[PDB]
Amino acid sequence: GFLGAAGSTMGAASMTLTVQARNLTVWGIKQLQARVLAVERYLRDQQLLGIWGCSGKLICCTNVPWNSTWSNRNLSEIWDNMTWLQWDKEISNYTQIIYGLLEESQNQQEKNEQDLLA
């Protein structure tokens, strides 16, 4: 219902992204501060998608390949017989590099857009 697929396989969870995607006295200042933070967290994730050319997509396909050093696994090892919580922990080492790679793939295409239209 909220995290209904949390214990499931990547395959099973593939159609549930919309489920998570949408869930966003002086004393009361604390609640305001929390609201402000939630907005800020939201926006940084949205920017990252935009700069990767993933604006508007839940499942964005890019031009960056997978390395065997990030994941030494195949289809029945990654999607099946696996769950997102564990898997994400398993590859946490490469989060930063992938993001840098995604930015570069986008930059390389945009330059070819202004020119190639010409």
């Binding site: 214990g7 992204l17 869930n23 929390a34 964005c60 390949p65 997978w66 997102w84």
Partner: protein
Amino acid sequence: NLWVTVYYGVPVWKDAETTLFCASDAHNVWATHCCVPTDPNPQEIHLENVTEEFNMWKNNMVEQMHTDIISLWDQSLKPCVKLTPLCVTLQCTNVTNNITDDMRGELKNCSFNMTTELRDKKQKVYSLFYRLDVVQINKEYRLINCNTSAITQACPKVSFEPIPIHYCAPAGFAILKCKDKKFNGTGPCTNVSTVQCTHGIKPVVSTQLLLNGSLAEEEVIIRSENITNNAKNILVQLNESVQINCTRPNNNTRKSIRIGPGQWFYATGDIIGDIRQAHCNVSKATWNETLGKVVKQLRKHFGNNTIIRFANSSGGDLEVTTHSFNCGGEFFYCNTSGLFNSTWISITLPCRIKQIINMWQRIGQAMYAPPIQGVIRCVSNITGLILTRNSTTETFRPGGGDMRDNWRSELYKYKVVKIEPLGVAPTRCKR
């Protein structure tokens, strides 16, 4: 030959700490505090095949509840009348009229010179005090907190009944709960769900005996941070409720004294009828059996054949040697030593009444409780115990004082995490 795809809305999370919203069922201090109604029918979603590690001893929301309950209490008193002008030399006598023998000297009938609404006028008044709050100098008395700090008066309209409050997560966060029976306080639980908010928890403050909280459901459950060590307390939930009936039987009146330009002091008035000691009744028919159950569970940790003694408290101040109980705004200090006398292998607890009261043992601010007119009778449930600790025998004694454990004892089954919707995974697609 798999390529990167970025997935948004992935159902994963990590440990986190944040601000929670308070909510209620819609002049009580917590009624004016939470202006948010709860979900009339709160949601809970079972998470199939999810194992999650909880740790009640490291549960950060506990610190939040403790910090906020203090903030609110204190805020409640901030705009009320200060009693500074009443810190005067007192002239007191032994009013022992129409009393039982144990009350011989419990009250002091004091009189003094004080202000009126005009700066150049004075009045003589008198009132009754409990000896716990009055100290003799070398007939001459002083209030007990005149050599420590300021004393202020609570506003008479504000009540403190512990209306249950629910705590709800902000967007981007989720509350995880163990529905796993016999949860051990720490470690992975394998029966979990995600919830919008916690259930309502009554902000009951006590020492030694935990009142009006959650029950243990299946059996008596003993939890501690470290079982081997004796430097830690032990928090015990009972599965059965134990009923306790408390009273302050004397019919009291109140008087309102004008003290200055626009305000009043609420003084102890007279007493109608005989004076008897305050007390609490615990049925022996339940208490005996209750400790036997506790011991049976202690045998899972300490040999299996040891002799377990219950005993009185260690030395300490009133707040920890007696049971601290509040009802109706009055503060009772009940002698529980006879509640913890037996060794394993009706009960009347006399109670003292204190009026000028430190709260949560944090030194600096003395609050004066206006008297409650009439008589009082309170009935409540003992739902748990605070206990502390030779190959053949061990002894247990009542504990308390650090209120974070009271909060901890209700919140032991909850955890807060943040949601992290962005994941990256391979696919047979390139673009």
